[PDB]
């Protein structure tokens, strides 16, 4: 029977699924790592001890524990981004969607949510594999992993707490498909990971990390990348929230053995009601517990890997949607409310300013508001929106992610870029915050294939094309078919940095995404401030 | 007879000149100063001693001892702008041309030349004012003075050469029109001075020296203004500049009066001949002698007599054409031509832009090259060419203007603003140096309504409507007729700041005269200058 498989730790029993008026097999729930439950919690994951029986793999596991965003309750915008199972410690679980009949030997896809580190789950209906699994016949995984103060409590030097132990989760699925995957009919040899933000930072960690570039064999990043702002902390900064953390919870703090003990005493929504207050006076676009700037998983920092070449030379396809700082602004910067226009005064305009370079002297702020300001006409509300919204995407994803496409291309054996533009028809979240960070998942996923999703049906093409490009891509290292007959998406080199817009509009390709902009924040305003 | 006039001073017998199928009359090259030849050179001027007899003022006076271009012998565009006339150091004289018959006592207009303070004269073609007083019913005055060292040359603390005699050249002008313009018919009361680039230049400081307020009614800036980068320099440099000279000269340095003896004794040509040599190591903006603020003329610095309202406060009419800082490339810029396209390479703009800057640091240089740059394309030759001509028009001369407008409206009685974008079609300069520096002058003074000059009839109607602006701004303080039915010419406020296009289209009103470029030099790159 196909939906019987043995494993290397054990039988799995999957369950049939329909997709699309046909069936596919579903394997749900496979454990990849011990439960990294008790004095486990904070520790490096342990591989899954083999099982005697089958494994029943017909239902979805356990979301890990995480924040719960209660801003607008019962608002589906929000919601379909919070856990739809019950929480848990015993979380490090994936899932697989295998075409039927099963294949021999086909391209793998491992999916890695995002959530930026503090949150996420593998569960998710946009997560749903059946769709791409199905029509671009690949074998779908999504992995999971430990996120918040249980994947990135960073106190350096003790092994109980090392930090980065949710960036080993990902890895140890990674090498579970590796040396499992084949008996689904996956090729291990051709495994593509994809993410996004949070886990298209994590995807490119996983390029830089030494202990990760052998388990995969090409990478694409959606609205996210390694050297994100938001996306590491430097091995001090750890420690300080660590111990910060402890003092919000009534730990002794004199040993890090004293401090872990403690924080493994408490109940997981302990740790979760206080991991906020960790942060530093500048903390609207940051998160608790991200990945550590350690010298083990990372050797050194970030930059200097990118600067020499010392991450996996492979295909990488990535890019941004139009707005990426809208839930950024929506969910922290007063002024913002999801049932108004949100116009901002010239007043709002200098303190969004201010927070989003909280560091910058007066010389920086006056940097950013000359790059940002409409002069034709200063109080314009919504130039004013749309300016800050600018400054925030530009700042904290668009331009971090054009320094990793222009470093790696150097050394790297193909890139291709991608600007997706386009607003979802049936988009909940209101009209102000546009092209929303996170809204082409669904499109990757083949969400509007289906009918009842009110689509329309150049979205339905869209998500088609776009289904086909990362299938492709995956499958080969080039998004386009061979000799076919429709538009060709250039390759991004160093001398054009050609790159292609993703609507529902026929394809152009444009040059220099953002650049203007990206020479700002990348190479300008650095010098200014490191000269004041 | 209306050619004859008793003046406080003697006699004149002027001559009576057709005009666009009419005549009025022409009083050429009447003395108001004493030659200030001898051991007058570098002196104040003194009053013309008055004579018996009848001056024959049937014809152009000397134009003053000045730097005369060869740069394109024979070159119309070029040598209608050189001396006309024989040159000397005797040139202290005016001309006035007044409608026919006499008026009993209408709006007087006095034209101030420009030239960089280095050259200039009131008989060139272009300035001929009989055109504008026959169409306006005006009495036009053109004044000379001294230019070069023999006007400019500032030992300060010494009274043979203290500096900015050429400037007390002009007073002089105006007290004698003062004085006398009564006894031509025209109206002392309503004296409106108006001038060109170092002409605006000298307009504006007569607005800001105490005594020079009382000589006029009100005033007209074109493509300059007094805090013009080009248009002063301190004491100090004076100083170093005529010493400079006199090194250059074989001349005893060890006083200023021996110094001063020795430039005395030497020949105008020799002057002349070595005068670009005392400027500074960036000199390709700049002009040997020019103004001094030297605590009489100027009581204390431009800029705080422009923000502190010390200046006289009345209604001023000002602009500046499309393309200020063509010539300056032309003339010093390696890699421009007059009969190339000029088309300048990726490297070719960074030594613009440091020429631009000279004493900017790397970080000032990366913020002019940031703001100018079109970063979609860095190499085209035709982009690299129009920004290099922006950098040098912004910074010398339109945002320098834009300054002193924004200053002085919050003081004066009325402030209008132009920005003339009309390319002359007989234009015999190539057509990449676009509305260039100097070109509207010939549409002020009416030369387009003379067929011969081969202007297109919709330059006519512009020269027209120009010629009614100016005349009705010199005799009312408003360019717009008294309820007529054409469009206005807005009013310049501090809120709005509006400004019109003058060019043969229709007008149409902007507002916020570059704007974003006028912020970057006047505020954010001096801020960033003086934190390095
Ligand atoms: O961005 N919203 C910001 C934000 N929210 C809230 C309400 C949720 C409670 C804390 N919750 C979050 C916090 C922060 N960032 C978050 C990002 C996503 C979800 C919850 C967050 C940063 C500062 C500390 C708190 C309060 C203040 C805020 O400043
Ligand atoms: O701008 N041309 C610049 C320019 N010309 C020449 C040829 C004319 C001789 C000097 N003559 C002028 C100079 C300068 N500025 C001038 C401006 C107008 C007319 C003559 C000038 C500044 C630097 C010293 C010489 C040589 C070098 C130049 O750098
Ligand atoms: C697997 O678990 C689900 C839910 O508990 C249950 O309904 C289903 O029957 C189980 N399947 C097998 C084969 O035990
Ligand atoms: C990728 O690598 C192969 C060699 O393995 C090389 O021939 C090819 O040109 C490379 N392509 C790019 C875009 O670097
Ligand atoms: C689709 O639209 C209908 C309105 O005709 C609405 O009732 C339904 O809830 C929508 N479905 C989804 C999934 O939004
Ligand atoms: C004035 O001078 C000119 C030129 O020298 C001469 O031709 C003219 O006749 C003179 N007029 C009188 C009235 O002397
Ligand atoms: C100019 O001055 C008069 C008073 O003399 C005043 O009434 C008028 O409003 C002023 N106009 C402007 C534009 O300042
Ligand atoms: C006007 O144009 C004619 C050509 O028809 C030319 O010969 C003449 O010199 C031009 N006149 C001027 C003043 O440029
Ligand atoms: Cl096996
Ligand atoms: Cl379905
Ligand atoms: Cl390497
Ligand atoms: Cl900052
Ligand atoms: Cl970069
Ligand atoms: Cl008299
Ligand atoms: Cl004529
Ligand atoms: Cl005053
Ligand atoms: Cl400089
Ligand atoms: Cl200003």
């Known amino acids: 029977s196909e939906l019987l ?23 749900l729930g496979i454990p990849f790592a011990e439960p990294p439950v008790g004095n486990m919690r904070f520790r490096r994951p342990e591989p899954k001890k083999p099982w005697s029986g089958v494994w029943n793999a017909s239902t979805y596991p356990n979301n890990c524990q995480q924040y719960v965003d209660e801003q607008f309750p019962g608002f589906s915008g929000s919601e379909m981004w919070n856990p739809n199972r019950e929480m848990s410690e015993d979380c490090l679980y994936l899932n697989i969607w295998v075409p039927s009949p099963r294949p021999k030997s086909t391209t793998v896809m491992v999916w890695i949510y995002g959530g930026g580190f503090y949150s996420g789950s593998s569960t998710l209906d946009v997560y749903n594999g059946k769709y791409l699994a199905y029509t671009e016949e690949v074998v779908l995984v999504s992995l999971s992993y430990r996120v918040g103060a249980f994947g990135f409590l960073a106190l350096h030097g003790s092994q109980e707490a090392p930090g980065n132990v949710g960036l080993l989760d990902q890895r140890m699925a990674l090498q579970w498909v590796h040396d499992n995957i084949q008996f689904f009919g996956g090729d291990p040899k051709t495994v593509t990971i994809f993410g996004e933000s949070a886990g298209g930072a994590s995807v490119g960690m996983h390029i830089l990390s030494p202990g990760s570039r052998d388990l995969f064999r090409r990478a694409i990043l959606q609205s996210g990348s390694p050297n994100c702002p938001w996306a590491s902390v430097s091995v001090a900064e750890g420690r300080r929230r660590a111990v910060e953390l402890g003092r919000n919870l009534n730990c002794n703090l004199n040993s ?8 493994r005493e408490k109940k997981p929504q302990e740790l979760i009601d206080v991991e906020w207050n960790v942060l530093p006076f500048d903390s609207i676009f940051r998160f608790s517990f991200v990945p550590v700037i350690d010298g083990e998983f990372f050797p050194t920092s970030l930059e200097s890997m990118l600067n020499s070449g010392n991450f996996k030379k492979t295909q990488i396809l990535l890019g941004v949607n139009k707005d990426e700082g809208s839930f950024f602004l929506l969910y922290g910067a007063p002024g913002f409310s999801k049932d108004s226009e949100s116009k901002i005064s010239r007043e709002d305009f200098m303190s969004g300013v201010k927070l989003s370079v ?3 002297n007066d010389l920086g702020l006056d940097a950013v508001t000359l790059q940002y300001t409409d002069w034709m006409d200063d109080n314009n509300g919504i130039k004013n929106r749309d300016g800050l919204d600018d400054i925030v995407g530009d700042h904290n994803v668009i331009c971090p992610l054009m320094h990793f496409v222009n470093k790696y291309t150097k050394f790297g054996n193909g890139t291709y870029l991608y600007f997706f533009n386009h607003r979802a028809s049936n988009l909940v979240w209101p009209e102000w915050m546009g092209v929303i960070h996170g809204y082409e998942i669904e499109f990757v996923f083949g969400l509007p294939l289906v009918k009842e999703l009110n689509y329309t049906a ?17 499958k080969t290292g080039n998004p386009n078919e061979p000799h076919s007959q429709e538009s060709k998406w250039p390759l991004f080199t160093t001398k054009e940095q050609k790159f292609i817009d993703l609507n529902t509009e026929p394809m152009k390709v444009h040059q220099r995404l953002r650049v203007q902009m990206c020479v700002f924040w990348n190479q300008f305003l650095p010098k200014l401030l490191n000269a004041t």
């Open 5 to 27: 498989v043995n494993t290397k730790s054990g039988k799995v029993m999957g369950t049939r699924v329909p997709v699309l008026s046909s069936h596919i097999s579903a394997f």
């Open 256 to 263: 890090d053995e004293e401090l872990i003990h403690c924080l």
């Open 358 to 360: 909280p560091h910058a």
């Open 458 to 474: 150049e979205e339905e093409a869209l998500s088609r094309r776009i289904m086909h490009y990362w299938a492709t891509f995956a």
